[PDB]
Subunit: 232 residues, 2 copies
């Protein structure tokens, strides 16, 4: 089965509106980059509310993973930041549509709302959250953004992009998440500070204060043992 790889059927271009939105976010929040974490944690919380709602009516909802958490891991050696939730997850089709295109039926209005909020010197920090496009703020600190996800209705898939295009492939590691999503950031050289535990704990603790689900950060304590530390 070499049809898929040889035909590049795993490669996609972003919808024009998304390209424009990514640029708007990056040029508006250039001064407050740390907000990407708040947006990822917020998306995580939302994904967990969704599976929680589904579990109300679907008895098999939490079979792939019994917990409802958000776990963060800093891999300094690999220069990677991971944010994992055991939320509803996304199917292969959802990864392409939810991350590659924009809807909300208020795109143009928000498109003019973002620019106007950045030509008259305003804040776009609260706007991106409102329109549900916080995910893209990840590019403020990452050269590469990777999304591994497992939804009950599909097999585990990986989405990856450097903002100039994106690809979606079946995860060769198989089903490792159970259910949920991991956002993996390959940090820009200048964003290395986010590989520091103290910086992440302070930020996470700062943005986890109003999150109803438990958020942990893989951290070290004193020999030197590692384990999940509750932040909220």
């Amino acid at each position: 089965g070499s049809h898929m790889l040889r035909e590049k059927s795993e490669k996609f271009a972003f919808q024009a509106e998304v390209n424009r939105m990514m640029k708007l976010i990056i040029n508006s929040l250039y001064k407050n980059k740390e907000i990407f974490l708040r947006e990822l944690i917020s998306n995580a919380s939302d994904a967990l509310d969704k599976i929680r709602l589904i579990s109300l009516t679907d008895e098999n909802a939490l079979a792939g993973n019994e917990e409802l958490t958000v776990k963060i891991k800093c891999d300094k050696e690999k220069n990677l930041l991971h944010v994992t939730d055991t939320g509803v997850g996304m199917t292969r089709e959802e990864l392409v549509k939810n991350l590659g295109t924009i809807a909300k039926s208020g795109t143009s209005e928000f498109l003019n709302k973002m620019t106007e909020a950045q030509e008259d010197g305003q804040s776009t920090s609260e706007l991106i959250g409102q329109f549900g496009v916080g995910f893209y703020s990840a590019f403020l600190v990452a050269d590469k953004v990777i999304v591994t996800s497992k939804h009950n209705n599909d097999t585990q898939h990986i989405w990856e992009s450097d903002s100039n295009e994106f690809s979606v492939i079946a995860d060769p590691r198989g089903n490792t998440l159970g259910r949920g999503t991991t956002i993996t950031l390959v940090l820009k050289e200048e964003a290395s500070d986010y590989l520091e535990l103290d910086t992440i704990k302070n930020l996470v603790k700062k943005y986890s204060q109003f999150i109803n689900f438990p958020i942990y950060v893989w951290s070290s304590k004193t020999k030197t043992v590692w384990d999940w530390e509750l932040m909220n």
Copy 2:
């Protein structure tokens, strides 16, 4: 009758490598933006060379327009800069493929030399011309780039892009060029200087010196009379 519009068959996404290339050009030449005009004049000359070579074997080559020139026009009120040549032109298929994708079988190595130059503080100004991707430097000064072209083997078409996507449509004005291409730039606000005659003349005069085709600028002379003025 209106399938193209109802299906957006006229819209295209850029190839990934082109997105990356446009970014590298803008990130490394932000200091010497005026080079866009050198590149457009250079491409125009190359287009005139092509039709000249075709006229050697084809006696009907120049029937659509006998002259071999480059005519530049400033339109301050409309915030536009036009660069028109009577070269070989481009068919609809060439507009889609040539401006939307990249070949040369050396894109990879070039994107490496570009990024490398930005790391060693080298001059990428010479590099882009050598690889034949000078067209993209227009985005250094324009929010929108429009390409109207007429090739002997097709009808007049229009290519347009704000860099987040591009579309190609049949020109509803019909065949107004005869043969050739017009590059129209909708200038960025920070690029208003290029709407000033004295400035454009100074740049065209400088960049046209070694061009073997006459290059003109639509200018005024003391009543106030407007006409083409030879620059080389």
